[PDB]
Amino acid sequence: KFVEKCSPIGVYTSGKGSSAAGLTASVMRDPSSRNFIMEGGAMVLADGG
DNA sequence: AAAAAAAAAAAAAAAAAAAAATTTTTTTTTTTTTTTTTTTTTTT
Hints:
Blueprint: H1 2-6, E1 26-29, E2 36-39, H2 42-45
Antiparallel strand pairs: 1-2
The structure holds one DNA strand.
């Protein structure tokens, strides 16, 4: 808990993802607009962290 | 000297020209939602 607070950028999660947030990133096509939406997990949401 | 022809000016009428002018509805598109199939994942 403290180390997450004290890093410049840091994210403290569980192995089992998080509440409405994964752990690894995922990317998925959107059939309507065809854009590959990129759900950001802890690993990428704290890149450089 | 009187008559008359011509001139300019003024007016009426018919043909052409001038001018004025937003609102309502429909359809594509995007975006989600729902059903049902397919796929994948957990159990004995």
